[PDB]
Amino acid sequence: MKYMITSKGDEKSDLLRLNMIAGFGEYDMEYDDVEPEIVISIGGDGTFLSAFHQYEERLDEIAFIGIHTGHLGFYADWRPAEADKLVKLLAKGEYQKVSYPLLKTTVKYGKEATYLALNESTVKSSGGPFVVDVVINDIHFERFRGDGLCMSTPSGTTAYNKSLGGALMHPSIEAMQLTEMASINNRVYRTIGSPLVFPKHHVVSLQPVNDKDFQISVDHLSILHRDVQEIRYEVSAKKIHFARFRSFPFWRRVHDSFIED
Amino acid sequence: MKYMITSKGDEKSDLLRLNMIAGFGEYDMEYDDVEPEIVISIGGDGTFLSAFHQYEERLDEIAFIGIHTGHLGFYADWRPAEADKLVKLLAKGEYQKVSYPLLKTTVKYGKEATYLALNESTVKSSGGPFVVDVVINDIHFERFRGDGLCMSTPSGTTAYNKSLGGALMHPSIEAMQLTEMASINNRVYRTIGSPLVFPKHHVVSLQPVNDKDFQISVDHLSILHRDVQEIRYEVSAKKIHFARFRSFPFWRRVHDSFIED
Amino acid sequence: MKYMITSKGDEKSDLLRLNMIAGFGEYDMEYDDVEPEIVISIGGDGTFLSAFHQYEERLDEIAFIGIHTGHLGFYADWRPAEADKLVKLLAKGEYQKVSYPLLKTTVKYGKEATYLALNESTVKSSGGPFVVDVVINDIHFERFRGDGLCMSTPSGTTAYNKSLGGALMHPSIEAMQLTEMASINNRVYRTIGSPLVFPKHHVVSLQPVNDKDFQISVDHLSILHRDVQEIRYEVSAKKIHFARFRSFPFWRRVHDSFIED
Amino acid sequence: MKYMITSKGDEKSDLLRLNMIAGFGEYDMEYDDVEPEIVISIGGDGTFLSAFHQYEERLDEIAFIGIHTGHLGFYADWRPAEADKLVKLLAKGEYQKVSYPLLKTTVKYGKEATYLALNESTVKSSGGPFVVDVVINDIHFERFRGDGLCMSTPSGTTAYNKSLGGALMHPSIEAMQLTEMASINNRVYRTIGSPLVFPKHHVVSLQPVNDKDFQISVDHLSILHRDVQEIRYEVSAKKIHFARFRSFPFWRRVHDSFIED
Ligand SMILES: C#CCCCn1c(Br)nc2c(N)ncnc21
């Protein structure tokens, strides 16, 4: 079928890409980076993230694969020494697919802008103090003062979510997790402190109190949005699909990355 | 139908219990504490927990209700001023039920003992050092040294789980969460640190390294088990069912208990 | 003697300032905001911080006093209802002085810039990743990857230091405390995680690895420094002196602000 | 002078001890374990702790030395390959001494019992709930509910203190640090959460609310004390003295143990 390969652009990744294309030429496989059904990422998790966002249009028509030419990654989880075996079973088709949930971020102005995130989306202030009211399913939950907030996908919990004390979540759980960044807690102000895990269809809304300008990140991308009226988080109806050629459990992936490998 | 009422045993709880029984006498309602289908708890969450464990036999035949005569609780979430309205709609039946997941704990010796937990189950050492190997779905994940571990139900995440830095989890998520107690982390030993959230059918197994005696707690109950070979945690196939007479969202319950009420 | 009064600029603070000046006119007291020996701050801790930095020149010639017209502050710790009693004992002189330590921050380029901080000084990246090597007393201690670092004075430990998990430190301890912001810890990278408390004469040096542009804050002030070669932290030889008219222990001040008042 | 050597009792430690005694026989050195002025510990930090408590009587008459036959320790910080060079410079005398602060723990009943701790002292409940009022310098600071509390010496901050989120403190700072274990924080109850660092002469007193039986630990030793009226912590007037034969900075010791070695 159709396929494309993105590369980190260093020496080993470009050469591994050319070898897989050459190997792909020995099968009923066509290179098309416009409407591929198999996107192969070569490099790191950042290379995978760029591949994911490049094709966020046709998510339900693509199965992704990540190859790590550096250290092990949670998305680029196949060693380069596995490329030739990868080439063959991709071309013979008839492989299993696994799907991970995604996080929808809606930004509303005084207009609307929506975004899809594979790792997480964060909100910080444009320089001054960051104060927002946190509204869960239309109920006002808390007034947050601090550096910012982070809403994470399940598979995103091993990234920035982990650095803020959030929990690690198996990606088969359709959920999103919200964590705090350096929150102020005293006798006047109060935050929950604990990370919060939300199921499907629960809507978390951030609403400004004074400053209406926020630095909003979605995975690697980060833009200052002006005159923001609301930020809305919820588990996405869309999922990312992976090609599954071997058993590599999420908890083993977590172990190899943090305990020992 | 059949029903029973348990009470904390102070003055207000006993008197509120006698008033509800008297109010119940005005309907087609029979007091039976052997095979009730409605268990009403009056007191605190601890009173509710005792009620839950008293009838862990016929869980799929009981709808629980908690009334708090003290501060608000996550299970005893109906004010005493609501007892008379509670009496009427319980007797007229035709109410909605909601179900929360439970945590199964299997203890194996050199024999087997299983337990059901509504909040959490914890493991500590019998005095000396606590060292266990943590095995997730037969894969060895880590060797834990510290004070102990805690596996929490979703609704249990607001209790002991919360005090250890775990995340708060909406009880509609069929999951369990494992947290660490004062873990040793150095150049020799390594723990994940982060709390871990497990879905249904994932089995977490604790296995001793040297000391085979552990203090194991299940909700309020705590017993020293001797010559333990394995502790096994997994989300239970059984659920606890609540009678639902009004909208009281879990996040509002969390807000009222920790932010302000 | 000479004195000046700074005000937050709202209605109550300006009026309380004019009342104290009028009360001061009944004594041997001269208003001079160029070479005062008593600086009175009216407003919040932020008002006090501006007063401190306005006169960082003649620190060993000034005794500061803070009055809070809002909530209680750690520097503005005298209620407005105490202004008239404040006026009298300030003019009669013969009061006790107490001194708190300060933090010296040296910035070196490819030139040198030094700063004094009453609360803390923080370092973040100019947008990209923040990576620095941490050098303690010329010994390379760690390579830090994360959002940033924070070095706090003793009295500064109740501010930003507290929000990052640092310890609260009695201001009679001549020390500085370094805390981490959302550090990445895996199998490749390693940080201490724990906050570190440094005594007098211990020099902590931050050195860039790739990006040489950092956003450096000193109390309220925050500037992007370009082509930074080194950031150097150490306990200052200068101290800030307070006028002491009553017993108000630091731990009571901490209690009133965080537990209950 | 007089000296003694304690050993962990395995094969290498006993043999290294006999070699040092034999090496000591070639100098003006006498083995006396009753009134030694040089106590040499061979094994781990636990071996050192037993040596410290064995001679807590004549602390101001002893210089301690620790040799690690296992991994590096914060007190047993000299490799076994250094024993013969150790023997010579110990016998030639004329070495430098360094001193670390200690923590005094006073227990009062309805009688008095005092203890000296090199690492830390902890308080937990005898089984039921642990509730104590925390009194700082006679001022009531907080009512603590949780698993327990831990007061740590400076050098003790790398042990249990570190596992609870406390800060690492250079041992030249005459201080003590108090940390919380799994504290309950809600709308009814309030703890500071943050670790607290206390200077010399600040007295921290724990006072029971209901249960008057506590499990109190002092370094390795742990005893259930009955009918406790008060627990009192303060920096000790006594210090432990080390023999200093080389530069081994505390921060390098911290680095080697937690970052890499
Ligand atoms: C090291 C480093 C920087 C972050 C790498 N990274 C990315 Br990108 N996505 C990640 C993920 N989902 N889980 C863990 N790590 C991730």
Ligand SMILES: C#CCCCn1c(Br)nc2c(N)ncnc21
């Ligand atoms: C205050 C106090 C002691 C714990 C009360 N408690 C119990 Br019992 N179950 C609880 C729960 N599920 N969520 C929150 N709190 C809970």
Ligand SMILES: C#CCCCn1c(Br)nc2c(N)ncnc21
């Ligand atoms: C509320 C709020 C914002 C921070 C106020 N604040 C300032 Br400014 N200095 C502070 C200090 N030293 N200790 C505690 N709080 C402080």
Ligand SMILES: C#CCCCn1c(Br)nc2c(N)ncnc21
């Ligand atoms: C590994 C392990 C168990 C604790 C060892 N240990 C002891 Br004993 N005292 C210690 C200390 N002061 N700093 C760090 N570690 C210490």
